[PDB]
Each structure stands twice: as C-alpha cells, then as structure tokens.
Amino acid sequence: MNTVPFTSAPIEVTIGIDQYSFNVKENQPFHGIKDIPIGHVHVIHFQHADNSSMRYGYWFDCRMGNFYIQYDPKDGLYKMMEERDGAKFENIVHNFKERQMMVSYPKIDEDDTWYNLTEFVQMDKIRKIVRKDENQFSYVDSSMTTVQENELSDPAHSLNYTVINFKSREAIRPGHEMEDFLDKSYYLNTVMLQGIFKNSSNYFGELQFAFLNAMFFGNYGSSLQWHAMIELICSSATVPKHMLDKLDEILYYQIKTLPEQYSDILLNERVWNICLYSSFQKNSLHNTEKIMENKYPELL
Amino acid sequence: GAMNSSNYAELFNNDIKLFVDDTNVYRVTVHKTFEGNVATKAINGCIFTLNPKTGHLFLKIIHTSVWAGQKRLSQLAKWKTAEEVSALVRSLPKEEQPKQIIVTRKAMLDPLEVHMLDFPNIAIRPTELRLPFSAAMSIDKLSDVVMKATEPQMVLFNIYDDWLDRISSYTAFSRLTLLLRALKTNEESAKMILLSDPTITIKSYHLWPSFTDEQWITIESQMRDLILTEYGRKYNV
C-alpha cells in the first residue's frame, strides 16, 4: 500500500483521489493520502474553494516512483513531484503516518469500482496521450484541448487522443463509400484495431481514460472522444463477441459511477439513443441498456 | 451553410455551382399482386444536375437495371446519386469543376459529402428554397429520353434554350422555377397554357416554345394565375 505525502495545504481545496473526495481547509495540518492500492493507475485531483474553475490533477502509478504534492505559490497550484532519494521519502512518510496527518484511501473490500473503471488503462498509454516525458506522472485539467479540437492551439498542452472522424478518407475506402459509412466495421477492425491500437485492450484503455478525464475534470474534448469510441463500435455490424461483452461491462460501471446531476452535460442524447435503440449493437449491451433506462430514462 | 432568399443573387455570380435534385432517381408504380399483396415496379429515373448561371443540365438517366437485386432502394438511390455526381465532377476539367454543390434535399448531404472527400474545397450545401425540380419529368423531351433509355446514359441539355441571349440568368432561373412550379401544381393546365396556340412551336434543339418577349409576359401571367387558383382550392382561402 503506497503513499502520496503533501508538504502542506496552504489553500482551501477539494482533493479527489480516484472516485473519492475530501475538503481540506486553508493551512489545515494535512500531509497526504496513504493505503493507495498497488496495481492500478490513480488520479489525484483538485478544485480550489476560491476558484471552482480549473479542476486539475495528476495520473500516476506508485510502482513507477515516489510521488508527493507541494503547493507552488507562484503558479498557484498543487504540483506533483518525484522524490529520487528513497530514504528521505520513506522517512517523510513514516513521520506523517506516526503523527496520523494522512487520510486513508477509503476502499471497501467488496468494491471493484476502480478496477472496473481502469481495467485497460496503463500509465505508459496515458504518457503518449499526455506528452511531458521528463515526468512519470501526467497533468490533466478542465481546459486542455485535444489534437482533433486543435485541427477544427498550443500543441504541448494537448490531449493526443486517437483521431476518429466518420467522414474522413481514413474512415472510407474509395469505392466502398455507402458500405463503409453505414457499416463502420472496416474502420473499427482494420484501421483502428489492427492498424493503430494493435488490440482491443489499448482501444478500451483510451476509451476508459477519455471517460475519466470527462468525469473528473469536465474536459469537453475527452467527452467527445469517449462518445466517438462507443459510437464506432456500436456502428459496426462485425465486432468480436468478447469486445461487445467487455464494452457492456465497461459502459455499465461508467454509467453507474457518473454523478446523477452531471448526466445532462456528460451524456450525448444522440449517441446513446443511436447506440441502444438504432445501431447494429442495439441488442448487444444488456447491462448498459438496463442501467441507462433505470437511471437516465429522461435522456432516452 | 444553407442557401435561402437572403443569399439568392449568389446563384448568378461567377463561382461555378450546381444544384442536384434526387427526387426522380428512384421511381416506382405501386400495384396489386395475383395474391392481393402490394408490389412496386421501378421505372427509369434521372438525376437533375443544373448550373443555374448557364442553364447547362447534366441529366444522368437511371436505368431500372441498377436496382436489380439491391435492398433498401430509397437509401441506395441517395448513394447512387452521390456516386454519379462525384463521377461527373471527376469527368470535368479542373476549371469547369463546381466550387459548390447545392442539394435540394438534406438527406443528400452525407452521401454527397462522403463521395466528395477527395474534393475538400468543394462546398456541399443544403437550401431553404422549395425548388420545383421534381417537375422536370413534366418536360416532354426530358421524360421521353428517360423512358426510352435501355441502359445508363448521360444527356446534356440547356434548360433555358436561347433565353440568355435576351435575359439575365436571374430572370431565366425565375422563369424556369415559375414554369416548373406550374407544371408541379397542375400539369394539364400548365401544358395547355404552353401549347394552346399551335403557331408557336418548340425548335428541334429546344425544350420550351419559341415565345417572343411579349408572349413570355402573357405566358408568365397565365402561370401565376394557374398557381394562385390551385392555392385557393388546396386551402379553401
């Protein structure tokens, strides 16, 4: 069980750790988060009490190094940093634990929610979508635009999601215009799965990462990416049986975890109605259709 | 975006543009079977592709053979329209290719856009105008070449005959839309108005009769009267 210590908390802030969140008061003796489960990526995220605009945060994996948070009064945010001195770090964590100045990652033993949201998400794939190669952790915020959003401006601060465009030469084989537009199987299976992602695990990893950025940061481009990746599968007549069964599980946990009050801004009516009721896969997503119909029958 | 009353003069500027109407591509007669079920029989159709500035009409005849063994024909008809318009553009020299294509029906936008991905600089636009191009098959010589075709064929016409020698392309388009609106509202009455005087004929190389400037004003008035009557009937007003 790993630890992300905090130097201090000089400004009042709501702190997220994965799907959990805690209020910290200005200058409260808060020194971090302990008992973080090894084996998963994690996100530690922030919303300042005095500017609820710019949700921002850090994707990390405790197996890749010793990470801490320190407030920067110049840039005005909580920054993630790596401590290269193992013995200094162990000595910092042990002191803060002894003085019980750390919140415990509050996982219920029965509860597979975080596993179910991050099953295919790998830190090495995150670091290719979020490019800042001198750090082992990845910064995301509310305002970062995607490579696709930038085509339609600072390339260094962009989310490099895989570009999906249903009306693009990549999506449509010359001479198969109607076939490829109405049945996206070619685009899903040859171009995206065999061509770019190499396997369904990498595709699902990006889909799950896009959802979490949408949910935790209200990142609009992430939301567009999550919907495009759902729609590409649902609009294909030919999808491997294992991919459909796994997609149903993925979407079920995403819809289950979404705050009820954000469904209006995080769910695209057109895509979900199309996916559940008109698409080739209208009858393939039993779990997802049942939770959507019982939780968000207004949207449908 | 969409072509409307507000940007009407744009049709007659020097940017090459084409209207595409797919109304007459997929045509059927509905009939009873021996067992008393209903079936359709397709008849020959056409794409109506018109340069509103020049009057040049690219009439692509759609032979019933293109539907043989196909499913969802009303959907296929939009994609076949887009395939043929795309083929037409690629067949034209670069300096003759349109800068814009305006579709009379919004269902043609995605099929045409997908077929024209190779031409990112050609704008595909809808229109708010309710254009009567469905009535093209009420022009006797266009109906005749469609119904006689035994194979796919492209036929080139000037839908304005020689009018541009005497009038602007704005006035020629207004005359064409009034004639087609009349033919669409009451075909028998419109055709009577156009041919009632046997001394005015249609030249072998023309679609419409050889009216003097004064006879066109009379004709145009008779067409307006036809349209308003029919409107008072439809609506009892």
Curated annotation (Swiss-Prot), chain A:
Subcellular location(s) of the protein: Cytoplasm; Nucleus
Effect noted on mutating residue 236 to A: No effect on interaction with PRP8
Xref: Gene3D superfamilies: 2.60.34.20, Aar2, C-terminal domain-like (1.25.40.550)
Keyword field contains Kinase: no
Listed Pfam families: AAR2 (PF05282), AAR2_1st (PF20981)
Key words, A-Z: Cytoplasm, mRNA processing, mRNA splicing, Nucleus, Phosphoprotein
The UniProt record lists the keyword Nucleus: yes
Residues with the Phosphothreonine modification: 257
Phosphoserine modified-residue sites: 236
GO cellular component: a single term: cytoplasm
Leucine-zipper, as annotated region: 244-265
Domain of life: Eukaryota
GO biological process, one term: spliceosomal snRNP assembly
Family classification: Belongs to the AAR2 family.
Other comments on record: Present with 7330 molecules/cell in log phase SD medium.
Protein name: A1 cistron-splicing factor AAR2
Species the sequence originates in: Saccharomyces cerevisiae (strain ATCC 204508 / S288c)
Organismal lineage: Eukaryota, Fungi, Dikarya, Ascomycota, Saccharomycotina
Curated annotation (Swiss-Prot), chain B:
Region (RNase H homology domain): 7-237
Subcellular location: Nucleus
Effect of residue 21 to N: Reduced growth at 30 degrees Celsius. Strongly reduced growth at 16 degrees Celsius
Biological function: Functions as a scaffold that mediates the ordered assembly of spliceosomal proteins and snRNAs. Required for association of BRR2 with the spliceosomal U5 snRNP, and the subsequent assembly of the U4/U6-U5 tri-snRNP complex. Functions as a scaffold that positions spliceosomal U2, U5 and U6 snRNAs at splice sites on pre-mRNA substrates, so that splicing can occur. Interacts with both the 5' and the 3' splice site, as well as the branch region. Has a role in branch site-3' splice site selection. Associates with the branch site-3' splice 3'-exon region. Also has a role in cell cycle.
Domain observations: The MPN (JAB/Mov34) domain has structural similarity with deubiquitinating enzymes, but lacks the residues that would bind the catalytic metal ion. Contains a region with structural similarity to reverse transcriptase, presenting the classical thumb, fingers and palm architecture, but lacks enzyme activity, since the essential metal-binding residues are not conserved.
Subunit structure and binding partners: Component of the U4/U6-U5 tri-snRNP complex composed of the U4, U6 and U5 snRNAs and at least PRP3, PRP4, PRP6, PRP8, PRP18, PRP31, PRP38, SNU13, SNU23, SNU66, SNU114, SPP381, SMB1, SMD1, SMD2, SMD3, SMX2, SMX3, LSM2, LSM3, LSM4, LSM5, LSM6, LSM7, LSM8, BRR2 and DIB1.
Comment field (misc): Present with 468 molecules/cell in log phase SD medium.
Protein name, UniProt field: Pre-mRNA-splicing factor 8
Range covered out of full length: 1836 to 2069 of 2413
